[PDB]
């Protein structure tokens, strides 16, 4: 994981130099897994089916 740190820091420096080479935001700081946003779904691939907890 020190491998992960040392590739991370040079990756950060690379994208920093890239953002300075062509002006855009740098967005260098990590973030955790975020909360998922709204996204539409329709039952065209399959109409839903009951699950009916029968087993005994």
């Amino acid at each position: 994981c020190r491998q992960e740190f040392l590739e991370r820091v040079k990756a950060n420096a690379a994208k920093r130099a890239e953002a300075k080479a062509q002006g855009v935001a740098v967005q260098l700081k990590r973030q955790p897994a975020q909360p998922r946003e709204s996204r539409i779904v329709s039952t065209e691939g399959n109409v839903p089916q009951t699950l009916a907890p029968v087993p005994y």
């Binding site: 909360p35 946003e37 709204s38 539409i40 039952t43």
Partner: protein
């Protein structure tokens, strides 16, 4: 403008659900990115592993409450301290009630009643937030300056 933003944000999602029903779709809802937290169990017969957690989330005593930004990490904490606290997904009116009644802020030590937006500009005019409603917006829509 924030009021218009709230009512628009409610109306468009209402219409999302209605039009998905009309199209035979099912509108999932955007996951709530915010919570409120309250402590239940007091200072004692607490294990250390949640003790530090509560000291991190500023839940020193019973019925002292706060917000949290939702992430995978904070969700791990809430799942950890599930037996000891109560949480849910709050509303604008609840937050309005809180920040107007028990809204108490920290000026460089020394918890203070808000009682004016001049406190808010002198402290948070750094970040452009210079009033209590800007603050409420910054919470209920988790801004950059939520921490």
């Amino acid at each position: 403008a924030y009021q218009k933003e709230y009512e628009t944000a409610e109306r468009n999602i209402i219409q999302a659900k209605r039009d998905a029903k009309a199209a035979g779709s099912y509108y999932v809802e955007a996951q709530h990115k915010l919570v409120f937290v309250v402590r239940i169990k007091g200072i004692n017969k607490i294990p250390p592993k949640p003790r530090k957690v509560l000291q991190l989330l500023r839940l020193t005593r019973i019925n002292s409450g706060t917000f949290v930004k939702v992430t995978k990490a904070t969700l791990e904490l809430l799942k950890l301290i599930e037996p000891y606290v109560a949480y849910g997904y709050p509303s604008y009116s609840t937050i309005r009630q809180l920040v107007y009644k028990r809204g108490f802020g920290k000026i460089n030590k020394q918890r203070v009643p808000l009682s004016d937006n001049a406190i808010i500009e002198a402290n948070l005019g750094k970040y452009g937030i210079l009033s209590i409603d800007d603050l409420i917006h910054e919470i209920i829509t988790v801004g950059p300056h939520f921490k």
